Specification:
Layout lengths: L5 E2 L11 E6 L13 E6 L9 E3 L2 E2 L7 E4 L4 E6 L8 E7 L7 E7 L4
Antiparallel strand pairs: 1-2, 2-7, 3-8, 4-5, 6-7, 8-9
Protein name: Ig kappa chain V-II region 26-10
InterPro entries: Ig-like_dom, Ig-like_dom_sf, Ig-like_fold, Ig_sub, Ig_V-set, IgV_Light_Chain
GO cellular component, one term: immunoglobulin complex
Length: 113
């Protein structure tokens, strides 16, 4: 199946810095029609699932411009302008190109000390 290199594992940043979660793939997640299939995820302690981007960069209806997704067909990253206190938590990503869909991710965004 298609592999996905998830990185980094941890992201000790400061409240105000920038972010860049990486989510690579073995092959291009581009379909014959030219459509891409990859989404991002974010979770806290025990709240409902959160979605920032569902299509490479396409943000969800409610996601501030602070969050941006981009990269090549074999590279996807979650960049954040200013990592605030709400951005903290756990991040993940997934693809909807192959079946079963391959899931991955786990970047721990915790503030340094």
């Amino acid at each position: 199946d298609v592999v996905m290199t998830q990185t980094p594992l941890s992201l000790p940043v400061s409240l105000g810095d920038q972010a860049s979660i990486s989510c690579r793939s073995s092959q291009s997640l581009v379909h014959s029609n030219g459509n891409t299939y990859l989404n991002w995820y974010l979770q806290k302690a025990g709240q409902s699932p959160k979605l920032l981007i569902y299509k490479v960069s396409n943000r969800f209806s409610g996601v501030p411009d602070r969050f941006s997704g981009s990269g090549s067909g074999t590279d996807f990253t979650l960049k954040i302008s200013r990592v605030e206190a709400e951005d903290l938590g756990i991040y993940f990503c997934s693809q909807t190109t192959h079946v079963p869909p391959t899931f991955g991710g786990g970047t721990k965004l915790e503030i340094k000390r």
